[PDB]
Motif scaffolding. Structure first.
Motif, PDB file in Angstrom:
ATOM      1  N   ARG A  75       0.822  -1.204   0.000  1.00 41.08           N
ATOM      2  CA  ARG A  75       0.000   0.000   0.000  1.00 41.08           C
ATOM      3  C   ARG A  75       0.859   1.258   0.000  1.00 41.08           C
ATOM      4  NH1 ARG A  75      -4.024  -2.040   4.849  1.00 41.08           N
ATOM      5  NH2 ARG A  75      -4.892  -3.850   3.739  1.00 41.08           N
ATOM      6  N   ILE A  76       0.206   2.409  -0.123  1.00 40.45           N
ATOM      7  CA  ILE A  76       0.884   3.701  -0.074  1.00 40.45           C
ATOM      8  C   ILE A  76       0.348   4.469   1.127  1.00 40.45           C
ATOM      9  CG2 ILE A  76       1.316   5.872  -1.265  1.00 40.45           C
ATOM     10  CD1 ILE A  76       0.725   4.195  -3.899  1.00 40.45           C
ATOM     11  N   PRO A  77       1.053   4.480   2.255  1.00 42.18           N
ATOM     12  CA  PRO A  77       0.573   5.250   3.407  1.00 42.18           C
ATOM     13  C   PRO A  77       0.663   6.743   3.136  1.00 42.18           C
ATOM     14  CG  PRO A  77       2.746   4.357   3.851  1.00 42.18           C
ATOM     15  CD  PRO A  77       2.301   3.756   2.549  1.00 42.18           C
ATOM     16  N   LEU A  78      -0.465   7.427   3.300  1.00 42.79           N
ATOM     17  CA  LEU A  78      -0.560   8.857   3.054  1.00 42.79           C
ATOM     18  C   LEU A  78      -0.533   9.591   4.385  1.00 42.79           C
ATOM     19  CD1 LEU A  78      -3.451   8.615   0.460  1.00 42.79           C
ATOM     20  CD2 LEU A  78      -1.040   8.953  -0.089  1.00 42.79           C
ATOM     21  N   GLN A  79       0.366  10.565   4.500  1.00 41.34           N
ATOM     22  CA  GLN A  79       0.531  11.329   5.726  1.00 41.34           C
ATOM     23  C   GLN A  79       1.063  12.706   5.364  1.00 41.34           C
ATOM     24  OE1 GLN A  79       3.838   8.704   7.562  1.00 41.34           O
ATOM     25  NE2 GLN A  79       4.719  10.769   7.546  1.00 41.34           N
ATOM     26  N   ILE A  80       0.611  13.723   6.093  1.00 39.98           N
ATOM     27  CA  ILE A  80       0.960  15.099   5.760  1.00 39.98           C
ATOM     28  C   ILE A  80       2.450  15.318   5.968  1.00 39.98           C
ATOM     29  CG2 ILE A  80       0.267  17.497   5.999  1.00 39.98           C
ATOM     30  CD1 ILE A  80      -2.239  16.723   7.218  1.00 39.98           C
ATOM     31  N   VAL A  81       3.175  15.470   4.873  1.00 35.86           N
ATOM     32  CA  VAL A  81       4.587  15.823   4.893  1.00 35.86           C
ATOM     33  C   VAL A  81       4.674  17.332   5.063  1.00 35.86           C
ATOM     34  CG1 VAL A  81       6.764  15.687   3.600  1.00 35.86           C
ATOM     35  CG2 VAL A  81       5.100  13.838   3.440  1.00 35.86           C
ATOM     36  N   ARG A  82       5.789  17.804   5.628  1.00 36.45           N
ATOM     37  CA  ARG A  82       6.029  19.215   5.956  1.00 36.45           C
ATOM     38  C   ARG A  82       4.773  19.866   6.544  1.00 36.45           C
ATOM     39  NH1 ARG A  82       6.687  17.885   0.929  1.00 36.45           N
ATOM     40  NH2 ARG A  82       5.128  18.525  -0.622  1.00 36.45           N
ATOM     41  N   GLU A 109       2.018  21.775   9.017  1.00 39.83           N
ATOM     42  CA  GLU A 109       1.902  23.158   9.463  1.00 39.83           C
ATOM     43  C   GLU A 109       1.905  23.204  10.988  1.00 39.83           C
ATOM     44  OE1 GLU A 109      -1.679  24.974   8.052  1.00 39.83           O
ATOM     45  OE2 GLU A 109      -1.150  27.011   8.679  1.00 39.83           O
ATOM     46  N   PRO A 158      -4.609  27.939   7.898  1.00 42.86           N
ATOM     47  CA  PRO A 158      -3.772  27.126   6.992  1.00 42.86           C
ATOM     48  C   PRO A 158      -3.469  27.794   5.660  1.00 42.86           C
ATOM     49  CG  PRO A 158      -5.924  26.103   7.467  1.00 42.86           C
ATOM     50  CD  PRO A 158      -5.649  27.108   8.526  1.00 42.86           C
ATOM     51  N   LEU A 159      -4.412  28.546   5.099  1.00 41.37           N
ATOM     52  CA  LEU A 159      -4.179  29.246   3.842  1.00 41.37           C
ATOM     53  C   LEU A 159      -3.560  30.627   4.032  1.00 41.37           C
ATOM     54  CD1 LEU A 159      -7.719  28.461   2.365  1.00 41.37           C
ATOM     55  CD2 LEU A 159      -5.756  26.913   2.555  1.00 41.37           C
ATOM     56  N   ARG A 214      -7.732  44.371  -5.110  1.00 42.15           N
ATOM     57  CA  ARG A 214      -7.833  43.293  -6.083  1.00 42.15           C
ATOM     58  C   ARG A 214      -9.241  42.708  -6.176  1.00 42.15           C
ATOM     59  NH1 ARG A 214      -5.035  37.571  -5.367  1.00 42.15           N
ATOM     60  NH2 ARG A 214      -7.058  37.427  -4.296  1.00 42.15           N
TER      61      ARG A 214
END
Ligand SMILES: Cn1c(=O)n(CCCO)c(=O)c2c1nc(Oc1cccc(OC(F)(F)F)c1)n2Cc1ccc(Cl)cc1
Ligand SMILES: Cn1c(=O)n(CCCO)c(=O)c2c1nc(Oc1cccc(OC(F)(F)F)c1)n2Cc1ccc(Cl)cc1
Lengths: 606, 127, 66, 114, 57
Positions: free
Chosen positions: C1-8, C10, C28-29, C54
């Motif tokens: 599988r491909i474990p998905l986890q927030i890299v870098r 916040e 976050p934005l 703007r």
């Protein structure tokens, strides 16, 4: 009349539940209570999370803590959140423990890659396409990826190679690959300074631009800020070579061209001097390599300005060419040794023009020994070594000068042509496969009728036979001669009187003229206008990408003069301490790029 | 305005002309006869019986120019001391020149002029 | 599988700040308080004038005098 | 386009032998045919004895096609003296039948050139 | 092209002309089969109507 009545009608168990007893009241369209409370944001579940992920994020956080479906039985919440490409939902779902099944590989023949495609082969293909559509998401690559640029390169490659193997579904894999290729470029568009543009292109020497070139990322390359950086390494000694006049450019390029043996004698006797370093800048190296090839072709035109000697010694010009020939044979051994090669169509014209020189020297030596004296050339045999060497030399003289066309990509005007004319050639080569069937059919037919009347080379005037005579004769008497006769009629060089015979038979001559006439109609009115019709349509679809392909090709032409290996032209050719800071700065640059790209893509969703 | 895209196409054709002229003169310059050995005491391709077509470079270039229009006869490939291997190679170089110039590089020019004229007829009234 | 986890990942300093302690609540934005009060025409500034120019002119006259 | 499994794609195409694909062909339904899932099903009846003829290299394809081409009088002498043998069934797969029919027509035209 | 290749393929599926030209001259189930098709059609029409109503946005 046609009586209309509901076939395979549904069921309507009660009427009390029509106004909302069973709480799982499926309507005619299979919309339960939760489906209506989700479609209308009113704030047994089954798969109501997939109906919330697919519209918006208000109740998605609510369902995350608490048969007829409109989704296939393989879709996972994270897969559909990646298909929708919403940043806030993918983030919410990735904060927890979610996974995606890794696809095995393109050509997988293991136990389940064969026993799953032999049971359904439809569910398998659909599941694979959905996994690849989830993985190729600019928002699932932004977060949850160490470097989103190399992942995008590898995904674009894997998806481009999957539209060929998977014969069907070829329209979805190319759009996914174009989605990755467009994400890897829209992330480099967010660089604000040049200090953080050389961090990306030099990661792990432009070590990431080369990985982009080897994956055919034609849009990552040809990005204005990526080309404005290469044009400064190219003109390494010409600050402002873009403000100059075209005459000051021409007269400065010709001044460097006429000095190539002086700039090249240094770097051999002074590799670390002032003049010795002037032929390491890539533009000067280019001008010296292409002014050394123009001295090899001007010396081949002089080889025509004592012809009865059966085996002669080499002439002055053939002594003055041998260093170039040996340098070209040597410089092509290394390049096909530092690698595999056949994907460049210029390495076949360069491998065949060097074999003909070998066969020329291997035949003018065989004829220098074994042949003493000088008899008149009028009575030599046709397979005389001196007559074959002088033919191979000319066949290779054509290819040696057809190679100056590869130097067109360096120019802004003739580069896009040469790149767009070489993409119109792969649709000619498949059209010259239909014409071979017509040629062969009509040659068979025209030789089956005319081989009884084959005369001899003596019965004919001037004692000469064939179609290269002043009075053409015996045009359809051999198959090898019928094929040439039918080739030379495309250009109008075959006269009509070749249809007659001596013992004039007026029924066979008419049939033989009618076969020739129908050949002419099929080949010069039908199959020749069709080729123009195809080239017109193939050139309109090409002129859109004509500027990106040219820049991708010019970048590869530039990158070949950046190294130090083949610095010297062919005539003289034969005479972890930092690996963590360098990796840490790249991560900060990537963090900033991804942040501002996400901010720019959220705002733009209006 | 369709002429500035022809002038850059007549720069690709010059490379082909020069390459094939070099190749065709490197093979045929041993058999150059004189203006007296030929009938009517006349030499070149502007004769009634064309001869010495590929014997000089200045003459090979004209021979290859006049073959675009079909005004060069095929028998100019032969020689007197008939060598049937060099005559065939010399006819095959002429044939590949004809294919490259009259089937490939001439349909490409039409394909370009068709596309260049469609983008021009929009501004044709303002210019 | 491909474990998905927030890299870098916040920073998420507090939770009481999620409902608007620091007045410079960068989301976050990167949308501070003024950015949300400008995107929604509700009438430390930094460069909040560029976010008003703007979109429209209601608060542009307000940020030009404060 | 709404078929989810392959068990319910062979029920539609075999209704009343691909008896509904033929009715689609006789009505010139060029979009019902050429549907990706309808062609992915025909490509497995075509390559009846080549599981994975789409993963192979073009040279391994060429040298396997000419190997069957040069064996057409042997695969055809069976099915006449052994219609229910191992070798006799190898010329009932549609791809091999095709290669044998087009390598028998290339022996009739090479014999016309002679 | 795919419509034409399908007809070229369907001509080699039968058994009649199996052998090349040189050697050329030498209701028990009919109701279950019809009942499964009706269920498949019911499901297809249901999910097509569902995917067509929602798509009208
Ligand atoms: C195929 N063909 C042919 O071979 N010959 C050679 C026979 C003499 O040796 C012909 O003379 C010949 C011919 N088709 C012919 O009519 C065409 C009609 C329409 C189009 C066309 O095509 C194209 F537009 F011209 F390109 C050709 N004609 C002319 C002809 C001659 C006699 C009679 Cl009764 C009627 C018509
Ligand atoms: C380049 N070339 C050539 O030079 N000669 C002159 C040699 C005689 O002096 C030829 O006869 C010659 C030739 N290509 C030839 O086949 C073509 C096939 C497909 C396209 C094509 O191009 C175009 F569609 F026609 F435009 C040409 N043929 C004909 C031929 C002759 C012998 C044999 Cl075994 C096989 C084919």
């Amino acid at each position: 009349r046609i009586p209309l009545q509901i076939v395979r009608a549904e069921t309507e168990l009660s009427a009390e539940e029509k106004a909302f007893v069973n709480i799982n009241c499926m309507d005619p369209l299979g919309r339960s209570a939760l489906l209506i409370a989700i479609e209308n944001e009113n704030l047994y579940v089954g798969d109501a999370l997939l109906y919330a992920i697919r519209k918006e994020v208000v109740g998605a956080v609510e369902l995350l803590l608490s048969q007829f479906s409109e989704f296939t039985p393989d879709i996972t919440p994270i897969m559909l959140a990646a298909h929708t490409n919403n940043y806030e939902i993918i983030k919410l779902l990735v904060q927890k423990r979610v996974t995606i099944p890794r696809p095995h590989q393109i050509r997988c023949n293991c136990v389940e890659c064969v026993s799953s495609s032999e049971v359904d082969s439809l569910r398998h293909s659909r599941s694979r396409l959905n996994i690849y559509k989830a993985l190729a998401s600019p928002s699932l690559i932004a977060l949850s990826s160490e470097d989103p640029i190399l992942t995008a390169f590898r995904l674009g490659w894997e998806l481009k190679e999957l539209s060929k193997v998977e014969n069907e579904f070829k329209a979805e894999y190319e759009e996914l690959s174009q989605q990755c290729k467009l994400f890897a470029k829209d992330l480099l568009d967010q660089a604000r300074s040049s200090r953080e543009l050389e961090i990306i292109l030099n990661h792990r020497d432009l070590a990431k631009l080369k990985v982009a070139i080897k994956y055919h990322q034609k849009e990552f390359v040809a990005q204005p800020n990526c080309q404005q950086l290469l044009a400064t390494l190219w003109y390494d000694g010409f600050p402002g070579w873009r403000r100059k006049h075209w005459v000051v450019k021409l007269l400065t390029c010709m001044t460097i061209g006429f000095l190539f043996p002086m700039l090249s004698i240094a770097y051999l006797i002074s590799p670390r001097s002032n003049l010795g370093l002037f032929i390491k800048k890539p533009f000067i190296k280019f001008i010296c390599h292409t002014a050394s090839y123009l001295t090899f072709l001007f010396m081949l035109l002089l080889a025509s300005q004592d012809l009865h000697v059966q085996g002669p010694p080499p002439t002055v010009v053939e002594w003055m060419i041998l260093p170039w020939v040996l340098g070209f044979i040597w410089g092509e051994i290394k390049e096909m040794w530092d690698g595999g090669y056949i994907h460049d169509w210029w390495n076949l014209m360069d491998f065949a023009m060097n074999s003909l020189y070998l066969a020329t020297i291997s035949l003018k030596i065989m004829a220098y020994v074994k042949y003493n004296g000088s008899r008149p050339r009028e009575e030599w045999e046709m397979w005389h070594p001196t007559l074959i060497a002088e033919a191979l030399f000319a066949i290779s003289n054509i290819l040696s000068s057809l190679r100056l066309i590869s130097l067109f990509t360096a120019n802004s005007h003739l580069g896009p042509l040469q790149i767009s004319l070489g993409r119109m050639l792969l649709d000619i080569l498949k059209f010259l496969f239909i014409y071979c069937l017509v040629l062969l059919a009509f040659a068979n037919g025209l030789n089956q009728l005319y081989f009884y009347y084959e005369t001899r080379a003596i019965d004919e005037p001037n004692n000469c036979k064939g179609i290269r005579c002043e009075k053409q004769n015996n045009a359809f008497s051999t198959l090898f001669e019928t094929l040439q006769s039918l080739f030379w009629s495309v250009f109008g060089l075959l006269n009509l009187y070749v249809t007659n015979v001596k013992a004039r038979h007026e029924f066979t001559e008419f049939v033989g003229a009618t076969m020739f006439g129908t050949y002419n109609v099929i080949s010069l009115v039908v199959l020749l206008n069709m080729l123009i019709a195809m080239m017109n349509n193939s050139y309109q679809l090409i002129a859109d990408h004509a500027d990106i392909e040219w820049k991708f090709a010019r970048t590869k032409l530039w990158m070949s003069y950046f190294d130090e290996g083949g610095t010297l032209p062919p005539p003289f050719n034969i005479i972890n301490a930092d690996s963590l800071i360098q990796n840490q700065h790249y991560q900060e640059v990537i963090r900033n790029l991804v942040k501002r790209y996400v901010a720019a893509m959220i705002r733009n969703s209006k």
